[PDB]
């Protein structure tokens, strides 16, 4: 084995002047970048880990002139739906939230199994801990404020691969056949699909041919750089800055299917 | 014995922009929900207790341009009237009150007796130590803050049942013969009333036939869902969130009992 | 962690008078009513264990002038087809299996790995050691006896949370979209679908309108408790006590899926 | 001492376990022990026995289902220990005999009467409410199993047998096989078994336990060489006469069509050594497939 | 001391037997050793390698052939023993390198380039005309074998590896696996396998090794859960589309018609794990009946 420690910072949060909370529950192991833009290029030549330093502060950057709470507190069972309420919250451990105009800290007892991360799939819960959550219920306003994740892993076996980018659509088919983070669906009512399995800031660069519809637009998306034209057969790029795994954008073009190519690295 | 520890957020507060203050005294016993939603679910197979931890704190969510006062302190003697009065309650060791946009803790010199919980009614002094109190007497405005119970458990004696709920009316009589939360009285000039007997949200569901006055209408509660009609010969439902024990909602038809049928399910 | 102790008693078999057992096998995980239906309401805080104590009697209460044999030890690997055949039986540990007229127990090795219940779903494999049996093959007359688990659990990792829980029809469809227990499936020719995907003893409460065929009925299920009409517009509540997994209960009303309503709480 | 007193209680009655097994180096061997517990016996009430002879052979499931599956890897045998116990689980308000007694050459019609049977050695039968066991004097030479047929005697000792006459009710009791085996010649091979009819031909090529010949004036036939309880899984296309008829024959079972294409299984439980089952497809051979698994 | 003198000889070759098996109590377990030779290698006169990832579980015969005869009894597992060699059975007169090195991670893309293989432990390769071994970090968690399908995971360590990249000719040798395994709690049962399809649903319900899923535009599915080299057998009613067909697979032997009510069979090599093979016949799945064992 190798190791590491943490910082990193996991997406904020962002008002909610309203009384129910809200999470953007983010899921942990060591290659989700969704939880680790700079550590999931060192996975790429292990499998299994450890975990032995942990916590997410609230960093505290917005004065007190706002209130409310912003729950924080990590369920090992890293996955099933967060509920739907409070006292809910209020009743898995990982404790603490307190208010935005404060500086807190979180802390998670940490195991001891040679655990293994996902060069998939499998099943979330025999692949890693369990997701982090955080909600914030409050009126008063502003931007709250940020996290990230104090660490220190264990990366035993020495493996090494890995990836996700080009992907081209061949008028009967396709081809993602060369490491992944997206996932291109499309939904009917041509209007369509471009997506996310990975997590971090990325550099895209990309696809053409009729160009229709739009492109590049965006949903549930951190910062767009797009600087194309649409295309009718031009050129594209821009910039994400996700948020809990698979967030998507899309174009629009033509209800089946056919088109060019594309290639999304990480970056 | 078995064991616990805490993790409960008992209700809050709301404003007092007055100048006396104002009580919520809540009552502590294993079994009392308006003060346990998540442990009142392991003392029907038990019955006697310990406590060896238990605090509040103030949670603190809400900035200082808001202030007054957060009164907090118990009693043993959890059943007698609050004051009406601050020094009648800022002579009631607890102590520990500040002002709304800081963090404060609550501690409790616990006992050592073997007392029982109340697969009723007994007395308000020999089946648990004594309610909790809180006030808060300021004018400059907000939602203050929140507050649970830090606490550890000893349930002896391996015991095991319980429960209030399916109660219906015929019209000669009703029928509450299957476990409690609520009793349903009535008052004269058919208004008429719908209660608990414990604490915690809950989930309705219910009752039927002559659809009039209203129904599921509500007064000292805690949220309130109906998705019913009025009725008719309709069917209901509703989430309350109590608040201390014994919060009421009611139905409005007439004169004189006979109706239909409910069930009342804790969650 | 916590921990606890046994005191379950897991559905009984009935005669047999035939030459080849037949079995019950149920499922054992900390939560899967089918196996505990006092302890599938403590686990809704937590998520893994241990066991360190569980075994199982058949308590004998049928005389000698009746007899055969009550198969019964359990297979890690909680999971599989029984066989068919005893002797496929009589080749998986547990053992031990008597004659009917006398009083046996049964007895297992367990293990020491941090292994998780299910808020789901999974693998039955890594979540749950395995599936208990039990055979029977006699045909002198009986309705023999009955058995629950000796058992001291270990329950890790402060969680808290669940549910199956109100679930409406709407004419045109349906409505579970508030925490499961229970699938509801119906079989054409309208006699329906009433079940479970959870284990444990519940408090059902619900659900109305033309109060036809019938209701609340059940098959392979544990104690039942209706205090209902049937109701042609009525109320209802039942007590379930499950056995493994998935046990299911219906009603009777015709043809073809709208109805009311209903609401299912654990306990 | 006998003498005296004697309580033959209402109900007796025993508890037995799980036999988890027991293993050694090379010199030419690896071995075994028993558990195993090989089918009942049922009522009787009539004045005749009447048996189940099941046959001995290390793989002939029909009397091991827990060790005809490491002989698929060697070829020859032993036998060192090797006992049946009357289980004795019924009470005494029943009554009547079980016969119960080995005779080598496990192959052989069972007599049809008991003299006869109460003349071959075994020995070793006694009422229904009581716990009894039976003991072979097991030889010493390298016999080999069958990856089929041969002859029911250079390749196994020979079948056990038992019977039970009585008329007082009950469903009597169980027993097993106390052993220990030993398993020269490292090999390693063996199935069904799947056995397929080129309409030219057949195909059993891949271990036995039937043969399947066929008596002209289609009508045909669908044996076997090992002795147990099987289950049959099987053959098919046209989906004629019928098919999954029995004579000489245990136990049944089908869940098929006829089929004129379709699928089909039975269980059987046999009597001794090579009893029958068939078709009935018409007149001259070729078919479909199948597979037969021993259990 | 390596240093000045060195014989390379233009042959070298050794001599392997024929490892005859060892075995323990009850305790509540077994034992086991190697003895294996895992598929070879086949020249590469080209200038990238190109791999056969061999899946290893207790039951994948194509990584065990003779052992898994002994884990239809039984459920988890240990390796305490397991290293591969490249026996070395070709003159120096060849050469290039056969890469050979274990991923617990038995199940994942090989890659596609070197450097991808030459970061993944096991580390070692060699040139053909030499002896080699090779060796892996065995660990101690009770893990189960496929009675199916599963995750490949959480079932079994990781496939193995082996790539040879050279141009020089020959059929440079072959491997095998040392070992010593662990086999607890006592169960018993399994086959192919054997597994139905009836016009309304399927049947697979009797021990796999593959998953059949159907791709609409009726062309179709037919796979893997397990690895090693097999032996199908199978299937049948309308020989339609076509049949046994292949795509990320290894070496395919069908000796059937297509069939339209036929018979057939095929002999796969595969790959790492969940390798597929199909038919074609139409359009909404009812058909016939099949069967895999693994070998």
Redesign the interface.
Known sequence: GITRSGSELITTLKKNTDTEPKYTTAVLNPSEPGTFNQLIKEAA?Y??YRFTSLRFRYSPMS???????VALAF???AA?PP??????L????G?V??????GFILTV?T?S??R?VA??I??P???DFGKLIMATY???AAQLGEVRVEYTVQLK?????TSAQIGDFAGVKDGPRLVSWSKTKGTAGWEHDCHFLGTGNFSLTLFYEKAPVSGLENADASDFSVLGEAAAGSVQWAGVKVAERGQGVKMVTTEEQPKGKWQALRI
């Open positions: 030549q499998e299994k004065p007190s002139t706002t209130g409310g709470k369920d090992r069972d099933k509920p739907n309420d409070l006292a809910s209020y009743n898995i451990e404790c939230s307190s208010v935005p105009w404060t007892p195991d199994t040679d293994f060069d998939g499998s099943d819960k025999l692949v409050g009126q008063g076996n020495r493996t090494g691969s």
